[model samples]
Target: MARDFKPGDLIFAKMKGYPHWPARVDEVPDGAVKPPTNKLPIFFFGTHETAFLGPKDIFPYSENKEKYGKPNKRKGFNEGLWEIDNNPKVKFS
Candidate 1:
């Protein structure tokens, strides 16, 4: 492990395409991007592709009720991802 990472930290890494996988951080020793710890699941993406793996505690967004409130996981990640993309950021854009 190179160092510890927190949520909302923008990390760039190479990810191998895993079919229908859960979003996670990876620990590849000296590969290109090393994960915060060597324990989290490894997710890969092609250079043409990119994604933002969110907080572990916030995964399976359908689990929490009050915090997220009756999410529509059954619908699709499209909504969730759109929400994230539209979330508060350097959004003077």
Candidate 2:
């Protein structure tokens, strides 16, 4: 069965030669490479990077929390270092 994802949904994405990373489904911005019919646009949490990946390359974040643990906290206030550590489900304010 095909897993459908929408903008803002948390998920885990596996890239070639890289471990699964936390990401959120997002709208493909202008000038960005559009994902194919089987792929979706996603934003990486810690790095704030964007990429298009297919469902087979992604997993539900809720299901893998125990396996991967929580996403890392942002490193200082550097650009493109935003993460989901501040979210209530992952960390308390």
Candidate 3:
């Protein structure tokens, strides 16, 4: 299962034609009344510019701790798989 991003989490935006850079989650999307604990809109920083990102474009920093190690010297979250989030679930014909 894809990990849900929380406040104070470091993330990497999966931007096309650009290297994935590090960012910190400033806030998590929580809509007004009745929610399904999904469809979260992530607001972050350190990505250079822009503060909002889709769940699919963001990956947890801990995901690359092994190869990168402590993403920007920040650590705490448990290690998890590199599974893509919100990647448009498609059904096979």
Candidate 4:
């Protein structure tokens, strides 16, 4: 990222492949990394994830430790596998 951007900035969008979801960027300042339990809105989404998950289910733990676990052995989350999730009864077919 040569330069940072704001919410409505066309250049800052995330390619989530969902019609409703949106994206945003983050910052790392003062040697402190942010946590997952961060405030919403920061975590942009096209469609609201309500029934799919409950508020209490979003708790994050030791995010620093878990996330630092080395690179992938083969193809990774970037190669479409992460988006494999979908309700088999509805959107997935």
Candidate 5:
């Protein structure tokens, strides 16, 4: 889980087809929460991409909910869709 992430953070992220973009964390978009973290939902997202962009590309912290929620086990969930940075300042660019 990301120990140093917050709302509105910039992430160098990508999806299945599209290349990486600086997707910003919009809000903690709501969904069914699960266990381990005691339902302390920390989901975040940018512009919804439906079929194009996967959840990881939209929100870096989406991985945190994997063990708890099945929705996070999607196709690109564990993929390197994002730079996977807890410290956003230390970028790959």
Candidate 6:
């Protein structure tokens, strides 16, 4: 099946031992394996982190609230990579 994500889109991604965090899709690097591989490059918002993930590990940011309930106010979530407010509007910088 075709994947649901692409470059420039916003999504919530899952990492090992981490909560789903907001990120923006990024273009794969030159010579990297193509989209059919289900590998998507993404940039995290608050922490300025990045990763290559698959569709199975991500979902729409719109579903975040319902799926995870209120975001944590603690600074330690995701090892401080997650924003306390979980606001998608926050620029990545």
lDDT of 5 by residue, 1-93 (tens): 234434445443444454443344433334624332322222223222322233343434355334322233344333323323343232222
C-alpha RMSD for every candidate: 13.7, 6.2, 12.7, 15.2, 11.8, 4.6
Model 5 scores a TM of 0.31
Best by TM-score: 2
> Alpha carbon lDDT of residue 69, candidate 1?
33
- Model 2 C-alpha lDDT per residue in residues 1-93, reported as the tens digit of each score: 147777776677778865667776767677865546787886776566777888878776667766554433433212122354354123212
lDDT per prediction?
A: 0.32, 0.61, 0.43, 0.25, 0.35, 0.61
Identify the runs in model 3 with alpha carbons over 4 angstroms from their true place: 28-48, 66-93
Number of clashing pairs per prediction, in order: 3, 0, 0, 3, 0, 0
Considering TM-score, which of the candidate structures 5 and 6 is the better prediction for this target? Answer: 6
Clashing pairs in 4: 20-46, 21-45, 21-46
Residue 21, model 5: lDDT of 36
Q: Across residues 1-93, which tens digit of lDDT does each residue of candidate 1 receive?
A: 244443333222322332222222433324447444433433322211334343432233223322333333333233333333344121221
Off by over 4 Å in 5: 1-3, 30-93
Model 3 clashing residue pairs (backbone): none
Clashes of 1: 3
Q: Which ten residues in a row have the lowest lDDT in candidate 5?
A: 38-47
Q: What are the models' TM-scores?
A: 0.22, 0.68, 0.44, 0.19, 0.31, 0.62
lDDT of 3 by residue, 1-93 (tens): 167776556666544653344544444333535343443443323222434555666777567544433334222111111211211111123
> What's the true lDDT of residue 52 in model 5?
26
Query: Residue pairs in steric clash, candidate 1?
Result: 15-44, 15-45, 16-44
Candidate 6 has an lDDT of 0.61
